[PDB]
Backbone atoms as SQL, in Angstrom:
CREATE TABLE atoms (id INTEGER PRIMARY KEY, chain TEXT, resi INTEGER, resn TEXT, atom TEXT, x REAL, y REAL, z REAL);
INSERT INTO atoms VALUES
  (1, 'A', 1, 'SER', 'N', 43.189, -50.550, 48.746),
  (2, 'A', 1, 'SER', 'CA', 42.403, -49.545, 48.066),
  (3, 'A', 1, 'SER', 'C', 42.611, -50.138, 46.942),
  (4, 'A', 2, 'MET', 'N', 43.794, -49.892, 46.940),
  (5, 'A', 2, 'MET', 'CA', 44.343, -50.235, 45.057),
  (6, 'A', 2, 'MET', 'C', 44.140, -50.860, 43.826),
  (7, 'A', 3, 'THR', 'N', 43.670, -51.689, 43.114),
  (8, 'A', 3, 'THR', 'CA', 43.816, -52.523, 41.823),
  (9, 'A', 3, 'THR', 'C', 45.125, -52.867, 42.263),
  (10, 'A', 4, 'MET', 'N', 45.750, -53.834, 41.249),
  (11, 'A', 4, 'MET', 'CA', 46.869, -54.358, 41.256),
  (12, 'A', 4, 'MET', 'C', 47.496, -53.368, 39.719),
  (13, 'A', 5, 'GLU', 'N', 46.887, -52.580, 38.613),
  (14, 'A', 5, 'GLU', 'CA', 47.444, -51.953, 38.436),
  (15, 'A', 5, 'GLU', 'C', 47.828, -51.182, 38.799),
  (16, 'A', 6, 'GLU', 'N', 46.982, -50.342, 39.313),
  (17, 'A', 6, 'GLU', 'CA', 46.842, -48.818, 40.312),
  (18, 'A', 6, 'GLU', 'C', 48.429, -49.128, 41.254),
  (19, 'A', 7, 'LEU', 'N', 48.531, -50.128, 41.697),
  (20, 'A', 7, 'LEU', 'CA', 49.346, -50.670, 42.592),
  (21, 'A', 7, 'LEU', 'C', 51.025, -50.176, 41.598),
  (22, 'A', 8, 'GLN', 'N', 50.895, -51.343, 40.279),
  (23, 'A', 8, 'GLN', 'CA', 51.415, -51.020, 39.471),
  (24, 'A', 8, 'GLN', 'C', 52.259, -49.478, 39.040),
  (25, 'A', 9, 'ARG', 'N', 51.427, -49.268, 38.806),
  (26, 'A', 9, 'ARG', 'CA', 51.648, -47.748, 37.911),
  (27, 'A', 9, 'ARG', 'C', 52.628, -46.376, 38.930),
  (28, 'A', 10, 'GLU', 'N', 51.800, -46.378, 40.289),
  (29, 'A', 10, 'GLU', 'CA', 52.086, -46.854, 41.716),
  (30, 'A', 10, 'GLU', 'C', 53.635, -46.803, 41.763),
  (31, 'A', 11, 'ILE', 'N', 53.907, -48.119, 41.267),
  (32, 'A', 11, 'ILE', 'CA', 55.960, -48.746, 41.883),
  (33, 'A', 11, 'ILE', 'C', 56.633, -47.492, 40.610),
  (34, 'A', 12, 'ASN', 'N', 55.639, -47.819, 39.514),
  (35, 'A', 12, 'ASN', 'CA', 56.353, -46.877, 37.720),
  (36, 'A', 12, 'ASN', 'C', 56.844, -45.556, 38.610),
  (37, 'A', 13, 'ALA', 'N', 55.087, -45.008, 39.091),
  (38, 'A', 13, 'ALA', 'CA', 55.986, -44.069, 39.753),
  (39, 'A', 13, 'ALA', 'C', 56.772, -43.457, 39.996),
  (40, 'A', 14, 'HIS', 'N', 57.059, -43.629, 41.260),
  (41, 'A', 14, 'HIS', 'CA', 58.531, -43.553, 41.718),
  (42, 'A', 14, 'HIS', 'C', 59.795, -44.099, 41.848),
  (43, 'A', 15, 'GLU', 'N', 59.171, -45.181, 41.027),
  (44, 'A', 15, 'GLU', 'CA', 60.976, -45.655, 39.959),
  (45, 'A', 15, 'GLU', 'C', 61.294, -44.630, 39.217),
  (46, 'A', 16, 'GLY', 'N', 60.914, -43.578, 38.284),
  (47, 'A', 16, 'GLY', 'CA', 60.429, -42.335, 37.643),
  (48, 'A', 16, 'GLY', 'C', 61.620, -41.500, 38.565),
  (49, 'A', 17, 'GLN', 'N', 60.678, -41.040, 40.160),
  (50, 'A', 17, 'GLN', 'CA', 61.065, -40.225, 40.622),
  (51, 'A', 17, 'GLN', 'C', 61.912, -40.322, 41.143),
  (52, 'A', 18, 'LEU', 'N', 63.118, -41.692, 41.968),
  (53, 'A', 18, 'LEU', 'CA', 63.548, -42.218, 42.018),
  (54, 'A', 18, 'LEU', 'C', 65.307, -41.500, 41.445),
  (55, 'A', 19, 'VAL', 'N', 64.555, -41.670, 39.585),
  (56, 'A', 19, 'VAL', 'CA', 66.347, -42.250, 38.871),
  (57, 'A', 19, 'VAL', 'C', 65.788, -39.861, 38.464),
  (58, 'A', 20, 'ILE', 'N', 65.475, -39.498, 38.652),
  (59, 'A', 20, 'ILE', 'CA', 65.332, -37.866, 39.130),
  (60, 'A', 20, 'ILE', 'C', 66.190, -37.797, 39.693),
  (61, 'A', 21, 'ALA', 'N', 65.609, -38.109, 41.374),
  (62, 'A', 21, 'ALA', 'CA', 66.466, -37.978, 42.548),
  (63, 'A', 21, 'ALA', 'C', 67.722, -38.471, 42.610),
  (64, 'A', 22, 'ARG', 'N', 67.773, -38.909, 42.296),
  (65, 'A', 22, 'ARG', 'CA', 69.359, -39.455, 42.146),
  (66, 'A', 22, 'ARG', 'C', 70.302, -37.938, 41.295),
  (67, 'A', 23, 'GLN', 'N', 69.437, -38.494, 39.964),
  (68, 'A', 23, 'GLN', 'CA', 69.944, -37.154, 38.463),
  (69, 'A', 23, 'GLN', 'C', 70.201, -35.794, 40.183),
  (70, 'A', 24, 'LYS', 'N', 69.714, -34.988, 41.200),
  (71, 'A', 24, 'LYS', 'CA', 69.560, -34.533, 41.396),
  (72, 'A', 24, 'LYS', 'C', 70.711, -34.359, 42.472),
  (73, 'A', 25, 'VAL', 'N', 70.447, -35.866, 42.966),
  (74, 'A', 25, 'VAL', 'CA', 71.758, -35.365, 44.491),
  (75, 'A', 25, 'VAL', 'C', 73.071, -34.885, 43.968),
  (76, 'A', 26, 'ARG', 'N', 73.319, -36.197, 42.287),
  (77, 'A', 26, 'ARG', 'CA', 75.055, -36.045, 41.764),
  (78, 'A', 26, 'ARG', 'C', 75.682, -34.384, 41.288),
  (79, 'A', 27, 'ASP', 'N', 73.820, -33.755, 40.595),
  (80, 'A', 27, 'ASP', 'CA', 74.338, -32.201, 40.847),
  (81, 'A', 27, 'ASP', 'C', 74.351, -31.411, 41.803),
  (82, 'A', 28, 'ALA', 'N', 73.856, -31.960, 42.983),
  (83, 'A', 28, 'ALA', 'CA', 73.657, -31.400, 43.919),
  (84, 'A', 28, 'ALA', 'C', 75.491, -32.184, 45.312),
  (85, 'A', 29, 'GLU', 'N', 75.965, -32.640, 44.989),
  (86, 'A', 29, 'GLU', 'CA', 78.132, -32.902, 44.847),
  (87, 'A', 29, 'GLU', 'C', 78.069, -32.915, 44.828),
  (88, 'A', 30, 'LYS', 'N', 78.263, -32.790, 42.714),
  (89, 'A', 30, 'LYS', 'CA', 79.054, -31.275, 42.612),
  (90, 'A', 30, 'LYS', 'C', 79.541, -29.368, 42.063),
  (91, 'A', 31, 'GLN', 'N', 78.441, -29.160, 42.851),
  (92, 'A', 31, 'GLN', 'CA', 78.077, -27.964, 42.782),
  (93, 'A', 31, 'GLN', 'C', 78.144, -27.699, 44.753),
  (94, 'A', 32, 'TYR', 'N', 78.344, -28.338, 45.648),
  (95, 'A', 32, 'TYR', 'CA', 78.658, -29.229, 46.772),
  (96, 'A', 32, 'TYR', 'C', 80.235, -28.809, 46.403),
  (97, 'A', 33, 'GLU', 'N', 80.433, -29.641, 45.500),
  (98, 'A', 33, 'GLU', 'CA', 82.078, -29.568, 45.745),
  (99, 'A', 33, 'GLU', 'C', 82.895, -28.249, 44.592),
  (100, 'A', 34, 'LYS', 'N', 82.424, -27.435, 44.194),
  (101, 'A', 34, 'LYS', 'CA', 83.143, -26.442, 43.580),
  (102, 'A', 34, 'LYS', 'C', 82.834, -25.586, 45.020),
  (103, 'A', 35, 'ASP', 'N', 81.413, -25.347, 46.159),
  (104, 'A', 35, 'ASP', 'CA', 81.504, -24.732, 46.138),
  (105, 'A', 35, 'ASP', 'C', 80.961, -25.132, 47.644),
  (106, 'A', 36, 'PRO', 'N', 81.904, -25.437, 49.016),
  (107, 'A', 36, 'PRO', 'CA', 81.292, -26.455, 49.817),
  (108, 'A', 36, 'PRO', 'C', 80.687, -25.448, 50.979),
  (109, 'A', 37, 'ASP', 'N', 80.667, -24.529, 51.318),
  (110, 'A', 37, 'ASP', 'CA', 79.185, -23.081, 51.680),
  (111, 'A', 37, 'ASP', 'C', 78.239, -23.906, 52.511),
  (112, 'A', 38, 'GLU', 'N', 77.112, -23.587, 54.048),
  (113, 'A', 38, 'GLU', 'CA', 76.503, -24.418, 53.931),
  (114, 'A', 38, 'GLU', 'C', 75.171, -24.423, 53.732),
  (115, 'A', 39, 'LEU', 'N', 74.740, -24.183, 53.218),
  (116, 'A', 39, 'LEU', 'CA', 73.509, -23.848, 52.478),
  (117, 'A', 39, 'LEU', 'C', 73.779, -24.448, 51.248),
  (118, 'A', 40, 'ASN', 'N', 75.095, -25.151, 50.643),
  (119, 'A', 40, 'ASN', 'CA', 75.270, -26.837, 49.661),
  (120, 'A', 40, 'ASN', 'C', 75.586, -27.062, 50.249),
  (121, 'A', 41, 'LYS', 'N', 76.106, -27.479, 51.098),
  (122, 'A', 41, 'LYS', 'CA', 76.063, -29.301, 52.405),
  (123, 'A', 41, 'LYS', 'C', 74.255, -28.985, 52.874),
  (124, 'A', 42, 'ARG', 'N', 73.425, -28.264, 52.727),
  (125, 'A', 42, 'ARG', 'CA', 72.454, -28.645, 53.252),
  (126, 'A', 42, 'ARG', 'C', 71.266, -29.248, 52.235),
  (127, 'A', 43, 'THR', 'N', 71.082, -28.458, 51.376),
  (128, 'A', 43, 'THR', 'CA', 70.430, -28.548, 50.046),
  (129, 'A', 43, 'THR', 'C', 71.092, -31.040, 49.496),
  (130, 'A', 44, 'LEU', 'N', 72.845, -30.323, 48.969),
  (131, 'A', 44, 'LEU', 'CA', 72.633, -32.604, 48.856),
  (132, 'A', 44, 'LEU', 'C', 72.196, -32.580, 50.689),
  (133, 'A', 45, 'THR', 'N', 72.124, -32.799, 51.397),
  (134, 'A', 45, 'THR', 'CA', 72.160, -33.676, 52.586),
  (135, 'A', 45, 'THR', 'C', 70.381, -34.122, 52.984),
  (136, 'A', 46, 'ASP', 'N', 69.408, -32.630, 52.397),
  (137, 'A', 46, 'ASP', 'CA', 67.929, -33.000, 52.197),
  (138, 'A', 46, 'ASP', 'C', 68.545, -34.101, 50.407),
  (139, 'A', 47, 'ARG', 'N', 68.754, -33.413, 49.084),
  (140, 'A', 47, 'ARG', 'CA', 68.367, -34.249, 48.172),
  (141, 'A', 47, 'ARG', 'C', 68.569, -35.771, 48.036),
  (142, 'A', 48, 'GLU', 'N', 70.056, -35.847, 48.835),
  (143, 'A', 48, 'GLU', 'CA', 70.104, -37.264, 49.702),
  (144, 'A', 48, 'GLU', 'C', 68.608, -37.991, 50.424),
  (145, 'A', 49, 'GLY', 'N', 67.874, -37.507, 51.151),
  (146, 'A', 49, 'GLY', 'CA', 67.639, -37.720, 52.063),
  (147, 'A', 49, 'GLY', 'C', 66.020, -38.051, 51.117),
  (148, 'A', 50, 'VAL', 'N', 65.947, -37.207, 50.565),
  (149, 'A', 50, 'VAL', 'CA', 64.764, -37.576, 49.864),
  (150, 'A', 50, 'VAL', 'C', 64.758, -38.603, 48.711),
  (151, 'A', 51, 'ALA', 'N', 65.591, -39.025, 48.656),
  (152, 'A', 51, 'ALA', 'CA', 66.557, -40.718, 47.578),
  (153, 'A', 51, 'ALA', 'C', 66.130, -41.336, 48.453),
  (154, 'A', 52, 'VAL', 'N', 65.869, -41.059, 49.802),
  (155, 'A', 52, 'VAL', 'CA', 66.137, -42.804, 50.247),
  (156, 'A', 52, 'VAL', 'C', 65.007, -42.645, 50.754),
  (157, 'A', 53, 'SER', 'N', 63.811, -41.796, 50.777),
  (158, 'A', 53, 'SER', 'CA', 62.984, -42.100, 51.148),
  (159, 'A', 53, 'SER', 'C', 61.801, -42.299, 49.745),
  (160, 'A', 54, 'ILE', 'N', 62.064, -42.323, 48.856),
  (161, 'A', 54, 'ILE', 'CA', 61.426, -42.467, 47.480),
  (162, 'A', 54, 'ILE', 'C', 62.228, -44.278, 47.419),
  (163, 'A', 55, 'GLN', 'N', 63.159, -44.679, 47.376),
  (164, 'A', 55, 'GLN', 'CA', 63.730, -45.594, 47.834),
  (165, 'A', 55, 'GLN', 'C', 62.599, -46.623, 48.727),
  (166, 'A', 56, 'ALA', 'N', 62.100, -45.598, 49.912),
  (167, 'A', 56, 'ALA', 'CA', 61.496, -46.664, 51.140),
  (168, 'A', 56, 'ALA', 'C', 60.309, -46.975, 50.434),
  (169, 'A', 57, 'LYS', 'N', 59.658, -46.139, 49.536),
  (170, 'A', 57, 'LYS', 'CA', 58.502, -46.012, 48.948),
  (171, 'A', 57, 'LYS', 'C', 58.178, -47.247, 48.280),
  (172, 'A', 58, 'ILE', 'N', 59.269, -46.597, 47.329),
  (173, 'A', 58, 'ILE', 'CA', 59.141, -48.413, 46.486),
  (174, 'A', 58, 'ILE', 'C', 58.883, -49.487, 46.934),
  (175, 'A', 59, 'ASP', 'N', 59.711, -49.054, 48.045),
  (176, 'A', 59, 'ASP', 'CA', 60.039, -50.606, 49.113),
  (177, 'A', 59, 'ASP', 'C', 59.028, -51.541, 49.802),
  (178, 'A', 60, 'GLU', 'N', 57.788, -50.506, 49.551),
  (179, 'A', 60, 'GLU', 'CA', 56.548, -50.071, 50.826),
  (180, 'A', 60, 'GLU', 'C', 55.583, -50.956, 49.189),
  (181, 'A', 61, 'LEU', 'N', 55.609, -50.328, 48.708),
  (182, 'A', 61, 'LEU', 'CA', 54.594, -50.950, 47.130),
  (183, 'A', 61, 'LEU', 'C', 55.207, -52.542, 46.797),
  (184, 'A', 62, 'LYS', 'N', 56.305, -52.082, 46.659),
  (185, 'A', 62, 'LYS', 'CA', 56.390, -53.789, 46.450),
  (186, 'A', 62, 'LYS', 'C', 56.323, -54.212, 47.068),
  (187, 'A', 63, 'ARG', 'N', 56.054, -54.343, 48.303),
  (188, 'A', 63, 'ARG', 'CA', 56.264, -55.219, 48.948),
  (189, 'A', 63, 'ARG', 'C', 54.715, -55.895, 49.122),
  (190, 'A', 64, 'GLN', 'N', 54.154, -54.665, 49.193),
  (191, 'A', 64, 'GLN', 'CA', 52.346, -54.976, 49.009),
  (192, 'A', 64, 'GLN', 'C', 51.808, -55.355, 47.628),
  (193, 'A', 65, 'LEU', 'N', 52.123, -55.688, 46.708),
  (194, 'A', 65, 'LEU', 'CA', 52.025, -56.160, 45.471),
  (195, 'A', 65, 'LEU', 'C', 52.511, -57.326, 45.127),
  (196, 'A', 66, 'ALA', 'N', 54.019, -57.640, 46.335),
  (197, 'A', 66, 'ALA', 'CA', 54.294, -59.333, 46.109),
  (198, 'A', 66, 'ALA', 'C', 53.413, -60.195, 46.885),
  (199, 'A', 67, 'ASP', 'N', 53.064, -59.653, 48.037),
  (200, 'A', 67, 'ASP', 'CA', 51.651, -60.043, 49.026),
  (201, 'A', 67, 'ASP', 'C', 50.535, -60.281, 48.523),
  (202, 'A', 68, 'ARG', 'N', 50.070, -59.527, 46.964),
  (203, 'A', 68, 'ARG', 'CA', 49.344, -59.547, 46.312),
  (204, 'A', 68, 'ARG', 'C', 48.996, -60.944, 45.474),
  (205, 'A', 69, 'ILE', 'N', 50.295, -60.672, 45.212),
  (206, 'A', 69, 'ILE', 'CA', 50.368, -62.908, 44.715),
  (207, 'A', 69, 'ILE', 'C', 50.588, -63.679, 45.213),
  (208, 'A', 70, 'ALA', 'N', 51.220, -63.306, 46.472),
  (209, 'A', 70, 'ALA', 'CA', 50.771, -64.919, 46.951),
  (210, 'A', 70, 'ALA', 'C', 49.939, -64.649, 47.662),
  (211, 'A', 71, 'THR', 'N', 48.470, -63.722, 48.590),
  (212, 'A', 71, 'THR', 'CA', 47.139, -64.431, 48.512),
  (213, 'A', 71, 'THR', 'C', 46.704, -64.700, 48.051);
């Protein structure tokens, strides 16, 4: 239900979000190391999970796109 152009835009949008997400992991790391309390720990772990999940969506979108070039 996506054109090829839509699929590529969706890949590019997620790739942008990944870069932003990894930045927020870096910041949450330093915050955690400055002050390693439970809330700062939780926030780092959640920032990490967000990066993992975006990467998984990118992987899936790229798999679709590859399969359609093949198709």
